């Protein structure tokens, strides 16, 4: 299928004492594979998936150097953003950066992205074409003009369409046994007698990967949205994901209702029915 590599950076200023917190995590699809945390002891990019441990010392040295360099750019950003917004040095603020690339089921480049936020709001992002910037406000516009002058977009576009894609493919090959494995949901339905006259049917999807899934209820073959609840997809903690969807039904009428499960690991959608 389609695949992605993404990095997520979070930098939070510590006005009380010392340097900002900086945490970087890297993902291939829904699998975290590296982390760097400024507060940790190693001061190294660390592995978080077994297949990345295939890489040797030059890789780890190189990733550590780059991620520490990015962390210093973010440290300078916090200061600069405080000035832009005329903010006091007393308060903590947050910067986030997310970037990466998608390839299609043929592993060709599809799309790249680089976005940057300040205090939880859009600040500046590359547009879909990777050739220009969107700036949310006049502070971000100042940045935009700076980065236009530096011709940042051109170097970033080269990374996203080039390096990012090549290394994604490398990882997908090296981690093939899990990264290219689809884990269809293990599904079952439970039944919770809610009162004398109503029952709740809960359709579970467990231990799936990747995280994308659709759970839908129908009654008599049509979509049921009334009296349903659908929880946010959540990590199991072993690398797989969980979700459920529930509907409240009149007791005795459970058979009209069907839960429909769509997932990349399923040859065709599953249908579950309480009988």
């Amino acid at each position: 299928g389609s695949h992605s590599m993404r990095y997520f950076y979070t930098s939070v200023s510590r006005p009380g004492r010392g340097e900002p917190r900086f945490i970087a995590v890297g993902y291939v699809d829904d699998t975290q594979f590296v982390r760097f945390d400024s507060d940790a002891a190693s001061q190294r990019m660390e592995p978080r998936a077994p297949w990345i441990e295939q890489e040797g010392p030059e890789y780890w040295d190189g990733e550590t150097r780059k991620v520490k360099a990015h962390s210093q750019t973010h440290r300078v950003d916090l200061g600069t953003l405080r000035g832009y917004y005329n903010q006091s040095e007393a308060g903590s603020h947050t910067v986030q950066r997310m970037y990466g690339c998608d390839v299609g089921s043929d592993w060709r480049f599809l799309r790249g992205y680089h976005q940057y936020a300040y205090d939880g709001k859009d600040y500046i992002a590359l547009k879909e074409d990777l050739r220009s910037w969107t700036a949310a406000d006049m502070a971000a516009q100042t940045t935009k003009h700076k980065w236009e002058a530096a011709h940042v977009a051109e170097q970033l576009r080269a990374y996203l369409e080039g390096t990012c894609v090549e290394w994604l493919r490398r990882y997908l090959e090296n981690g093939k046994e899990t990264l290219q494995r689809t884990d269809a949901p293990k599904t079952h339905m439970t039944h919770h007698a809610v009162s004398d006259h109503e029952a709740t049917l809960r359709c579970w999807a467990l231990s799936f990967y990747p995280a994308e899934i659709t759970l839908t209820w129908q009654r008599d073959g049509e979509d049921q949205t009334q009296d349903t609840e659908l929880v946010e997809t959540r990590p199991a903690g072993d690398g797989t994901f969980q979700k459920w969807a529930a509907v409240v039904v009149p007791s005795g009428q459970e058979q009209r209702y069907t839960c429909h499960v769509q997932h990349e690991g399923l040859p065709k959608p599953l249908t579950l029915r309480w009988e």
Binding site: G62, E63, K66, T73, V76, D77, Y116, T163, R170
Partner: peptide, 10 residues
């Protein structure tokens, strides 16, 4: 694999 240190500050 990270991009090199070409991100400028804002």
């Amino acid at each position: 694999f990270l991009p090199s240190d070409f991100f400028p500050s804002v």
